[PDB]
Amino acid sequence: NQSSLLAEFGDPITRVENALQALREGRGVLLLDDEDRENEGDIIYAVESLTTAQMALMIRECSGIVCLCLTEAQADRLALPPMVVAFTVSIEAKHGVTTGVSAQDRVTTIKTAANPQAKPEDLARPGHVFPLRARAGGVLARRGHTEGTVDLMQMAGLQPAGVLCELTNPDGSMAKTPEIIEFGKLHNMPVLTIEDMVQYRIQFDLKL
Amino acid sequence: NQSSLLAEFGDPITRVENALQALREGRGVLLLDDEDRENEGDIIYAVESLTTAQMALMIRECSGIVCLCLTEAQADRLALPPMVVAFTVSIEAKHGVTTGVSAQDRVTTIKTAANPQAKPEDLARPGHVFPLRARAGGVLARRGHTEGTVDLMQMAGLQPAGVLCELTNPDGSMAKTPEIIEFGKLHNMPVLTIEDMVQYRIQFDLKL
Ligand SMILES: CC(=O)[C@@](O)(COP(=O)(O)O)C(O)O
Ligand SMILES: CC(=O)[C@@](O)(COP(=O)(O)O)C(O)O
Ligand SMILES: [Mn+2]
Ligand SMILES: [Mn+2]
């Protein structure tokens, strides 16, 4: 079962603690959601430590639809409305980029958007970076990779902005627990679940 | 120079004719835009012949932001407004898909959207497929990969719906003419330019 497969990453509390330390070290983590939800694994990176190499791995090994998980406050600061009456309108840096799709341009757009001093005019719309508004309460309100990203950053003591993308197998199928475990071992990325995070937050009265 | 590098693909007319035949054979082509525009190469496939394997190659070797090039008429049939007051709101098949990111789900969404008998209720919004409205006149009106895709399909006698994505190098940089030429040789894909198509259409009074 999933718990048996992830037991080599440790018990749920150790899986959360190892992931938080990986992010504090500027490294990525793999977050699995519920098996009855998407049963999908996402590469997660802190924006504060984001590099062109990390973005290039995400584009090469994931869907290529790299999402920028922001707080509702940061999304409001950037005047980002929902795309349709939690994908917001897509975004590009107004300055510092060319076509916007290059790993470097996506990082330039992500850093511009996550800047706590950012202004809406810093971002042109539409673009090739997809911001997602995290629900207030995080995984304790909505059990999605969007909320897991903000909560991982807040619990690691980092800026509440992270990038996520769905790990995709070479044949186009979406990675399932065994493929995610192998990818994490190969790329030294800790693997954890939203369930691990929810129980960690409830046990450590972790209001964020 | 670019013309010298593409001379091995033939003269401009042969580059267009070989690309059209590749599409009639259900194979993909690589379209370069102007070097003073994006200087980017896109993998192009007809939707009529689209396979999960072709979609998986596109996701693995391109940006992962796979766009569905539609006529303004097909976009109006699907009630697709521009994303911001030519990216439309993103789309997912309402039926036949799970999370929408899998190569198979993206093809299911693309075939549902390009169906000449499609109705807006067939597509949920937002999603992981990005439709683009082609300008009336195609490359003779706008010199973009969006217009090159519709024109390639119409000139090949195929349904006017195609998928495009920007060829991306493993390091996250965007492929330039030499990398595009090598990728085309390796994957048996003809390489051509918007300039080749514009001159072909003007010389053969090709109103579409
Ligand atoms: C990009 C994703 O990861 C989604 O998984 C969106 O994120 P959520 O898990 O719903 O928060 C995708 O399924 O659209
Ligand atoms: C996906 C692309 O290819 C764009 O190139 C959009 O297509 P256009 O070439 O502008 O028609 C990208 O640059 O947003
Ligand atoms: Mn998800
Ligand atoms: Mn283009």
Side-chain angles (χ1 to χ4, degrees), chain A residues 33 37-38 40 42 63 65-67 86-87 132 142-148 164-166, chain B residues 92 99-101 127-128:
Chain A
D33 72 327
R37 187 175 180 273
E38 293 174 301
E40 275 178 0
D42 286 18
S63 73
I65 307 172
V66 176
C67 300
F87 283 79
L132 298 171
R142 180 172 180 278
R143 303 172 63 95
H145 292 111
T146 304
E147 286 71 27
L164 70 68
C165 203
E166 310 95 326
Chain B
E92 304 284 44
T99 72
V101 285
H128 296 121

Side-chain angles (χ1 to χ4, degrees), chain A residues 38 42 47 76-77 84 117 136 148 168 174 177 192:
Chain A
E38 293 174 301
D42 286 18
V47 168
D76 295 327
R77 160 175 285 274
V84 181
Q117 303 290 279
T168 307
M174 303 308 297
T177 308
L192 80 168

Side-chain angles (χ1 to χ4, degrees), chain A residues 92 99 101 127-128, chain B residues 33 37-38 40 42 63 65 67 86-87 132 142-147 164-166:
Chain A
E92 304 284 44
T99 72
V101 285
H128 296 121
Chain B
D33 72 327
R37 187 175 180 273
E38 293 174 301
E40 275 178 0
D42 286 18
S63 73
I65 307 172
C67 300
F87 283 79
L132 298 171
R142 180 172 180 278
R143 303 172 63 95
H145 292 111
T146 304
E147 286 71 27
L164 70 68
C165 203
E166 310 95 326

Side-chain angles (χ1 to χ4, degrees), chain A residues 38 40 56 59-61 63-65 83-84 87 89-90 99 101-103 106 128 130 166 168-172 174, chain B residues 38 40 56 59-61 63-65 83-84 89-90 99 101-103 106 128 130 166 168-172 174:
Chain A
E38 293 174 301
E40 275 178 0
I59 296 163
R60 178 56 53 166
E61 304 290 350
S63 73
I65 307 172
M83 191 188 288
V84 181
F87 283 79
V89 178
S90 48
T99 72
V101 285
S102 73
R106 295 201 217 179
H128 296 121
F130 306 94
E166 310 95 326
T168 307
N169 298 315
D171 68 356
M174 303 308 297
Chain B
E38 293 174 301
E40 275 178 0
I59 296 163
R60 178 56 53 166
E61 304 290 350
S63 73
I65 307 172
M83 191 188 288
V84 181
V89 178
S90 48
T99 72
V101 285
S102 73
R106 295 201 217 179
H128 296 121
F130 306 94
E166 310 95 326
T168 307
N169 298 315
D171 68 356
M174 303 308 297

